[PDB]
Amino acid sequence: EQPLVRLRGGAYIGEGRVEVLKNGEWGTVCDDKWDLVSASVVCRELGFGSAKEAVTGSRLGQGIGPIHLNEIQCTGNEKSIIDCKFNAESQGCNHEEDAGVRCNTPAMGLQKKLRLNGGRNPYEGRVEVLVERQGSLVWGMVCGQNWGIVEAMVVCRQLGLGFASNAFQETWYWHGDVNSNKVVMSGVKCSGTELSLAHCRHDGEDVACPQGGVQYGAGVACSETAPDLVLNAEMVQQTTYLEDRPMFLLQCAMEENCLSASAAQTDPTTGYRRLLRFSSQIHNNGQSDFRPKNGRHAWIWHDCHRHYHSMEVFTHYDLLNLNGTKVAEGHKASFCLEDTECEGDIQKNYECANFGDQGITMGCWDMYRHDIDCQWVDITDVPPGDYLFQVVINPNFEVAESDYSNNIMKCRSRYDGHRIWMYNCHIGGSFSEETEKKFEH
């Protein structure tokens, strides 16, 4: 069956921004006359107790797109928040008033088979797991090989410390209490939704770990907040065009690797690249600032843009066959991360200009306009046809977010050979499943 309401953002199951399925599109509810009784109608609909809290003002993060409901006024007797009386004009409403709930839910009371060990912070440590070894109950560690944010998220969730902020593959700097210095779990990969590290895929007590620095064990760092990046779909829709650019203006772009491979043999003096340009306006809609993983030492000067780029692979840009295999070669752009404009009265902070600190503030967005170099897919080699355009933000889960189900954007693309039409542009998971089907057929 298809649910008509869901929670996004927010760390604990049963907590988050209320979003509702209306006209095949998910969309938020404005917080005017948001009340506890209505809130607890969504808590009951999702099968938890009832609202501790009727959260207002997007405190658990913002949405983008349609604000569907407004001034909800449930009686308390409705089987679903889509039955309560509501005011359908949200015009005075924006996405700093997206409502949210904190439902009463059971806490699985205490954790005894998993712990964080070492470190001065309750919120971080090497992750250790209780096992049985030769009769004794001992604490061992987890293989660090391919230990990422997603697994880290499952640990922090299981331990009740909110989100993951970091994951570590090799930890040698953490002391703690006596262990066994022996890897005890390994090969762990989590989907993200698991309720305990052990419920992810892992090999069992046959714990193949490599021999190296990854044998010390994975650690996490957890936080009660996290950023949430979203691409602005309406805008790649409004800003898309073709340009065939003489090669003599793409000298910079060539060396910074912004062209597909055929460009090597394209005539500098006389040649084209056909460039599908567009604007990437990435919002930070989560609960804290988005920040690059590394400090200044790792940032790399972008010759074309003439500023430092703190994230070497911020996006995947691709044009795809309808089956899903790339028809273009696509690109892995790198990004200066700054606040170009903010919502409402929020104050711009991060700036790239003078080796400035980089990041995207809560409530702001970072816009890489269509005319800037590398905002394209090179399409010189691509024949006319019926394709899917896709943009993935933060594609390798390199920096922690409160939601990765929204980091993908797809448009249907009809290419004449002479012009292109981008339509049905949207954030994956913003449509109903049936409707998400009709967009590929």
Ligand X SMILES: *[C@@H]1O[C@H](CO)[C@@H](O)[C@H](O)[C@H]1NC(C)=O
Annotated binding site for Cu cation: 305, 307, 309
Question: Is 258 near Zn ion (CB under 5 A)?
Answer: no
Question: Is 441 near ligand X (CB under 6 A)?
Answer: no
Last residue before each gap in the chain (C to N over 2.5 A): none
User: What's the min distance (Å) between Cβ of 323 and ligand X?
Assistant: 4
Distance (Å, whole) CA 21 – CA 62: 16
User: Contacting Zn ion (CB under 5 A), which of 81, 247, 336, 391?
Assistant: 336
Question: Is 321 near ligand X (CB under 6 A)?
Answer: yes
Which of these ranges, 24-32, 261-269, 304-312, 318-326, lies near ligand X under the rule CB under 6 A? Answer: 318-326
Extended strands (E) in 100-252: 100-103, 114-117, 124-133, 136-142, 163-168, 183-185, 219-223, 229-231, 241-246
Q: To which residue do tokens 């049936």 refer?
A: 434
With beta carbons less than 8 A apart as the criterion, state whether 332 and 313 touch: yes
With beta carbons less than 8 A apart as the criterion, state whether 67 and 28 touch: yes
User: What's the min distance (Å) between Cβ of 230 and Zn ion?
Assistant: 19
Which does residue 401 bind out of ligand X, Zn ion, Ca ion, none, counting CB within 5 to 8 angstroms by kind? Ca ion
User: What's the min distance (Å) between Cβ of 320 and Ca ion?
Assistant: 21
- Which residues are near Ca ion by CB under 5 A? 228-229, 401, 403, 406-407
Given the complex with ligand X, which of 112 and 441 has the nearer CB atom? 441
Which does residue 336 bind out of Ca ion, ligand X, Zn ion, none, counting CB within 5 to 8 angstroms by kind? Zn ion
Rg of the chain in Å (alpha carbons): 24
> Helix count (H) and strand count (E) of the chain?
5, 26
Given the complex with Ca ion, which of 30 and 400 has the nearer CB atom? 400
List, in sequence order, the alpha helices (H) in 60-144: none
User: What's the min distance (Å) between Cβ of 227 and Ca ion?
Assistant: 8
User: What's the min distance (Å) between Cβ of 47 and ligand X?
Assistant: 41
CA atoms within 13 A on the CB side of 23: 6
Backbone angles phi, psi at 425, to 5 degrees: -70, 135
User: What's the min distance (Å) between Cβ of 257 and ligand X?
Assistant: 26
Distance (Å, whole) CA 148 – CA 440: 31
Question: Is 270 near ligand X (CB under 6 A)?
Answer: no
User: What's the min distance (Å) between Cβ of 431 and ligand X?
Assistant: 23
Which does residue 229 bind out of ligand X, Zn ion, Ca ion, none, counting CB within 5 to 8 angstroms by kind? Ca ion
Which residues from 324-353 bind ligand X, rule CB under 6 A? 325
Distance (Å, whole) CA 165 – CA 220: 8
Question: What distance lies between CA 107 and its chain's CA centroid?
Answer: 26
User: What's the min distance (Å) between Cβ of 413 and Ca ion?
Assistant: 23
Given the complex with Ca ion, which of 385 and 429 has the nearer CB atom? 429
Strands 136-142 and 183-185, by their bridges, are parallel
- String of contacts with ligand X for each residue 186-205, x by CB under 6 A: --------------------
Residue 164 forms beta bridges with which residues? 222
Given the complex with ligand X, which of 322 and 342 has the nearer CB atom? 322
Which residues have CB under 8 Å from 7's CB, separation 6+? Answer: 14, 15, 16, 17, 18, 19, 42, 46, 100, 101
Which does residue 305 bind out of ligand X, Zn ion, Ca ion, none, counting CB within 5 to 8 angstroms by kind? Zn ion
Which residues sit in the known binding site for Ca(2+)? 228-229, 401, 403, 406-407
Phi-psi region of 391 (alpha: psi -120 to 50; beta: other; left: phi over 0): beta
Given the complex with Zn ion, which of 62 and 280 has the nearer CB atom? 280
With beta carbons less than 8 A apart as the criterion, state whether 229 and 290 touch: yes
- String of contacts with Zn ion for each residue 282-321, x by CB under 5 A: --------------------x--x----------------
Binding site for Zn ion (CB under 5 A): 302, 305, 336
Binding site for ligand X (CB under 6 A): 321, 323, 325
